[PDB]
Design brief:
This is PitB. By secondary structure, the chain is mostly beta strands. The protein has strands at 18-25, 34-43, 62-66, 76-80, 94-102, 111-112, 115-116, 118-121, 126-135, 141-150, 166-167, 171-176, 197-204, 214-221, 234-239, 244-248, 255-262, 267-270, 277-283, 289-297, 300-305, 312-319, 325-332.
């Protein structure tokens, strides 16, 4: 404001403080089972006034639970604790200072035959909560003033709240490999071998040239959650085998671009990608041929019709946690003499 970084109390009633966890999650991803647990630990030291920090009052482990019914907005799910001071009663005035950190527990990866689909990166940050206790009249005490300061930082400024008495202290990201929950009505049936993307050219017609290449271009957008560890920096592409190439990730933009050719019945394959990524694909125009597409996006079937000799483009196709493929048909009208 200032000073809004500090949660006061109205009158002599205990200050109220919720802690808000931010889970970052991309677009094609089912929110996982995950409890995030905050762990308060009593710190020593000396208040401004000369007094040592007061101790001997415990704050319990506070937890937020995520499950399949939690759905992101702006690629993040935000859940808060209740009042952390619920069921906590101090004995005497003074400055109680707690180290608050988030424990690395309460989530497990999806696993099929020793192989792991997903990944949770836990917030490493650690804070200093200053609980400022002050005398009631006549007697007893109250939680007067609460504030946070990030630990291990140089001249750490006071932590500003998102909402009233709510602090986004802990921030974690979740990643998921694409296309490995292929059965749209049962994600327990899990395939670690499923490919990130498939594109398959099908030339259609008696006059159709089924030996030539059709020229393609693809730009893939890795999702924002990629920026948060651990992260992909190489991509593996198979334009019909044994052509196998390790394309690299453009680090400031998190994109990969490719140019490849397909012949009739020829499949383009992206080996593996974090679910949540997007792609643009473009087949250059070729004389006589109207192109069409039947694509699966995160288990959902969608279509797109093209023009006769124009470049055919698919604009920002999501590559979800479910099935991901594309079958692009190139159709040519029959040459018949009479």
């Amino acid at each position: 404001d200032d000073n809004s970084a500090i949660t006061k109390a109205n009158g002599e009633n205990n200050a109220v403080v919720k802690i808000n966890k931010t889970l970052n999650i991309a677009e094609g991803i089912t929110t996982p089972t995950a409890t995030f647990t905050f762990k308060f630990t009593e710190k020593t030291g000396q208040s401004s006034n000369g007094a040592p920090y007061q101790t001997g009052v415990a704050i319990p482990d506070r937890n937020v639970e995520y499950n399949k019914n939690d759905h992101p907005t702006a690629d993040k799910i935000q859940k808060a604790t209740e009042d952390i001071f619920s069921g906590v009663a101090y004995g005497h005035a003074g400055e109680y200072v707690y180290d608050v950190a988030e424990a690395k527990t309460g989530w497990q990866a999806i696993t099929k035959n020793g192989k792991t689909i997903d990944a949770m990166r836990y917030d490493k940050r650690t804070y200093e909560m200053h609980v400022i206790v002050k005398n009631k009249v006549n007697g007893g005490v109250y939680i007067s003033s609460v504030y946070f300061k990030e630990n291990n930082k140089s001249n750490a400024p006071k932590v500003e709240s998102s909402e009233q008495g709510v602090y986004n202290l802990f921030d974690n990201t979740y990643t998921k490999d694409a296309s490995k929950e292929p059965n749209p009505d049962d994600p327990s049936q899990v395939d670690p071998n499923a490919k990130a993307l498939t594109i398959t050219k099908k030339v259609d017609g008696a006059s159709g040239d089924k030996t030539r290449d059709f020229q393609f271009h693809i730009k893939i957008q890795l999702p924002s959650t990629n920026k948060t560890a651990e992260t992909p920096v190489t991509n593996i592409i198979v334009k019909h085998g044994s052509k196998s190439e390790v394309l690299a990730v453009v680090t400031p933009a998190d994109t990969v671009e490719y140019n490849f050719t397909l012949k009739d019945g020829e499949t383009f394959t992206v080996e593996q990608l974090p679910a949540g990524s997007k792609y643009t694909v473009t087949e250059t125009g070729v004389a006589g041929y109207t192109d069409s597409s039947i694509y699966t996006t995160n288990g959902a079937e969608q279509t797109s019709q093209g023009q006769k000799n124009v470049d055919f483009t698919l604009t920002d196709i999501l590559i979800g946690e479910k099935k991901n493929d594309n079958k692009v048909t190139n159709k040519i009208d029959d040459v018949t003499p009479t």
